[PDB]
Symmetry: C3
Subunit: 172 residues, 3 copies
């Protein structure tokens, strides 16, 4: 509400879209808020992370909250590494990453949910390798594409929100 | 942009030179140029760059222009993520209704040409091939020269270099 | 570091470990390593990471090297947008001259090997295939082993994770 209220007039579709995604009935209240929170972190916009984070506490456990934020952090690294490896046409695929990412195997919350949040973040960062790998995993654990698609929509909407908000604050 | 140029460090002279050059270039309208420097400045998320350019854009852009430019950044902010992502997913989601409102695109409050140019510029900054191509095609359809489009791409890239350059000094001083 | 390593949240434990190790790693020499971490920190746009890494990098980076690293991030901030953009336009704009000044590339004020390594690290962060490839090539051209290049990519990625973790 207060976030929506801070959105400029030249950003009406974003506000509109933020309202519709927040009232989503496709994703769990945990799937939804965990996605919104991981997405918010992935935008790097403090205000957006603060307001989504504040509202998220009344919809997510401390464990869920931490898992959502850690998905953002770990994809921040993976999204750069794998995309780069992919740009090198596989010529370094034999080397050996050597990077820890245990949170992925042991998230502390349902893995279907962690994957959903990781997928959303990979969409924001733009790494096809990770977006595809996570999308495949979601399907393997029973998440339907309607829900996977809703996460893609949410990640995009939240990116718009952060862009819209960043501009108003710097100008006003 | 006079203060921005001054803010740049000697190790970023090329960007300063490029900023000086793109601003004095005449291949683009006074509206196309400042509207592109503005949507680009917005898309880079650097506060100082947006603030400086935004201020210098008022005596160079109409009210409706300044509005359409900032609105292009915001809406591309979402579209550049959505279409890019769906585009990676092997056609598996091409038959689903996005259900995303983007009316500003059909009604920017100014003739479409410039909105599309600024949308194109933003899509370059965010890195979305689907949108870059779509908007480039639309620009052509409504009579915009390649030279103009290419100049926007350059302006988008230079502003991005300026944001990076200034972001680092702000943080280190 | 230390203060940087210590700021990481607990749910970002893996990134803490990765930072601790990439900084203790020898694969890259101290200038290569810290110039890459500095260039990367800049590209993440996170002010705290840039400050901590920039300060720790004073003990291993000459004045010329530090400016080369920061300069690499700035120029790649522009090139990474330009070449990627042109690259998606299906060669339809390849006949036009960019006319963008890039003099720092040929003249970084230090050995190119390092400048190219840092530019490669930034290109990975911004996501421009055209530049990551062009620099990976040059890097191999003048020497530099895949292991060093791979270590920079890892460093760029690890630094991106730190910045995000801190931003959260």
């Amino acid at each position: 509400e207060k976030l929506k209220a801070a959105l400029p007039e030249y950003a009406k579709d974003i506000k509109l879209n933020l309202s519709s995604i927040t009232r989503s009935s496709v994703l769990d209240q945990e799937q939804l808020w965990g996605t919104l929170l991981a997405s918010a972190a992935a935008t790097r916009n403090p205000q957006v992370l603060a307001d989504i984070g504040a509202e998220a506490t009344d919809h997510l456990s401390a464990a869920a909250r931490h898992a959502a934020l850690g998905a953002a952090a770990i994809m921040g690294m993976n999204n750069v590494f794998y995309r780069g490896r992919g740009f090198l046409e596989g010529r370094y695929d034999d080397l050996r990453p050597g990077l820890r990412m245990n949170i992925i195997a042991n998230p502390g919350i349902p893995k279907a949910n962690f994957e959903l949040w990781s997928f959303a973040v990979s969409a924001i960062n733009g790494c096809s390798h990770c977006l595809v790998a996570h999308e495949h995993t979601l399907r393997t654990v029973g998440v339907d594409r309607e829900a996977i698609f809703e996460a893609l929509k949410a990640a995009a909407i939240v990116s718009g929100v952060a862009q819209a908000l960043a501009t108003i604050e710097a100008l006003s």
